[PDB]
Amino acid sequence: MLMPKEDRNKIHQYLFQEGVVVAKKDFNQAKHEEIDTKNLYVIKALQSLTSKGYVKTQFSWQYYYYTLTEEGVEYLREYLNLPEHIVPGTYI
Protein backbone atom coordinates (compact mmCIF):
# COMPACT_ATOMS: atom_id res chain seq x y z
CA MET A 1 0.00 0.00 0.00
CA LEU A 2 1.22 3.50 -0.77
CA MET A 3 2.45 5.42 2.25
CA PRO A 4 5.14 8.13 2.62
CA LYS A 5 8.62 7.00 3.53
CA GLU A 6 8.47 9.34 6.53
CA ASP A 7 5.74 7.29 8.16
CA ARG A 8 7.29 4.03 6.96
CA ASN A 9 10.49 4.98 8.77
CA LYS A 10 8.40 6.04 11.78
CA ILE A 11 6.87 2.56 12.00
CA HIS A 12 10.21 0.90 11.41
CA GLN A 13 12.20 2.96 13.91
CA TYR A 14 9.53 2.47 16.58
CA LEU A 15 9.59 -1.27 15.93
CA PHE A 16 13.39 -1.35 16.08
CA GLN A 17 13.40 0.72 19.28
CA GLU A 18 10.74 -1.24 21.18
CA GLY A 19 10.65 -4.72 19.65
CA VAL A 20 6.86 -5.09 19.91
CA VAL A 21 3.90 -3.14 18.60
CA VAL A 22 0.15 -3.35 19.22
CA ALA A 23 -2.41 -2.15 16.67
CA LYS A 24 -6.07 -2.14 17.70
CA LYS A 25 -7.93 -3.62 14.73
CA ASP A 26 -9.85 -0.43 13.97
CA PHE A 27 -9.50 0.82 10.43
CA ASN A 28 -10.49 4.42 9.72
CA GLN A 29 -9.11 5.31 13.17
CA ALA A 30 -6.72 7.76 11.44
CA LYS A 31 -4.59 8.13 14.60
CA HIS A 32 -2.56 5.34 16.14
CA GLU A 33 -1.23 5.72 19.66
CA GLU A 34 2.49 5.43 20.43
CA ILE A 35 2.89 6.54 16.77
CA ASP A 36 1.46 9.60 14.98
CA THR A 37 0.57 7.50 11.88
CA LYS A 38 -2.66 5.95 10.63
CA ASN A 39 -3.63 2.65 12.21
CA LEU A 40 -4.32 1.23 8.75
CA TYR A 41 -0.85 2.34 7.64
CA VAL A 42 0.94 0.64 10.53
CA ILE A 43 -1.22 -2.49 10.26
CA LYS A 44 -0.72 -3.00 6.53
CA ALA A 45 2.98 -2.13 6.63
CA LEU A 46 3.48 -4.67 9.39
CA GLN A 47 1.47 -7.25 7.42
CA SER A 48 3.78 -6.71 4.45
CA LEU A 49 6.66 -7.21 6.89
CA THR A 50 5.15 -10.43 8.28
CA SER A 51 4.70 -11.97 4.85
CA LYS A 52 8.50 -11.91 4.30
CA GLY A 53 9.19 -13.89 7.48
CA TYR A 54 10.48 -10.96 9.55
CA VAL A 55 7.78 -10.58 12.20
CA LYS A 56 4.87 -12.57 13.63
CA THR A 57 1.35 -11.63 14.70
CA GLN A 58 -1.49 -12.50 17.05
CA PHE A 59 -5.04 -11.18 16.63
CA SER A 60 -6.32 -11.86 20.17
CA TRP A 61 -9.48 -9.76 20.57
CA GLN A 62 -9.04 -7.46 17.57
CA TYR A 63 -5.65 -6.12 18.70
CA TYR A 64 -2.81 -7.31 16.39
CA TYR A 65 0.13 -7.93 18.68
CA TYR A 66 3.33 -7.92 16.57
CA THR A 67 6.79 -9.12 17.61
CA LEU A 68 9.79 -9.31 15.29
CA THR A 69 12.39 -12.02 14.71
CA GLU A 70 16.17 -11.97 14.27
CA GLU A 71 15.77 -11.73 10.51
CA GLY A 72 13.50 -8.79 11.29
CA VAL A 73 15.98 -7.01 13.53
CA GLU A 74 18.89 -7.44 11.11
CA TYR A 75 16.72 -6.40 8.16
CA LEU A 76 15.60 -3.29 10.03
CA ARG A 77 19.20 -2.64 11.07
CA GLU A 78 20.43 -2.66 7.48
CA TYR A 79 17.30 -0.79 6.34
CA LEU A 80 17.87 2.05 8.80
CA ASN A 81 21.65 1.88 8.21
CA LEU A 82 22.56 1.41 11.88
CA PRO A 83 25.81 0.01 13.35
CA GLU A 84 26.06 -3.69 14.07
CA HIS A 85 24.54 -4.41 17.48
CA ILE A 86 23.41 -0.82 17.96
CA VAL A 87 20.34 -1.51 20.10
CA PRO A 88 17.58 -4.15 19.87
CA GLY A 89 14.47 -4.34 22.03
CA THR A 90 16.32 -7.10 23.91
CA TYR A 91 18.26 -5.47 26.73
CA ILE A 92 19.34 -7.53 29.74
Partner RNA sequence: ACGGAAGGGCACCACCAGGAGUGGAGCCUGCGGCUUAAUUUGACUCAACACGGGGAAACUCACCAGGUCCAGACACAAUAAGGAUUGACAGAUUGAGAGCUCUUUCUUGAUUUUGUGGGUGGUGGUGCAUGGCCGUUCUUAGUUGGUGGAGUGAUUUGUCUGCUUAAUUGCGAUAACGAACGAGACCUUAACCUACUAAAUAGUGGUGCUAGCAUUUGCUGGUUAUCCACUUCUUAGAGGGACUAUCGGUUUCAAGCCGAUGGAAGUUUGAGGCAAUAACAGGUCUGUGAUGCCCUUAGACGUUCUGGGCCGCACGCGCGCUACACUGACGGAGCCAGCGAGUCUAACCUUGGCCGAGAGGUCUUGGUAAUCUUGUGAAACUCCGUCGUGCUGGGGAUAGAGCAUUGUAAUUAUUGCUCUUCAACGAGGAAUUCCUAGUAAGCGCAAGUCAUCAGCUUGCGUUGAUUACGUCCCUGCCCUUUGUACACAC
Binding footprint of other proteins on the chain (CB under 8 A) = 18-22, 25, 28, 34, 58, 60-63, 65, 67, 89-92
Partner touching 40 among RNA, other proteins, none, CB below 5 to 8 Å by kind: RNA
Q: How far apart are CA 14 and CA 82, in angstroms?
A: 14
By CB under 7 A, name the one of 9, 17, 25, 71 that touches RNA: 25
Q: What is the DSSP string of 24-36?
A: -S-TT----SSSS
Cα 12 from chain centroid?
A: 5
Q: Which residues bind RNA (CB under 7 A)?
A: 1-5, 25, 27-28, 40, 44, 47-48, 50-52, 59, 62, 64
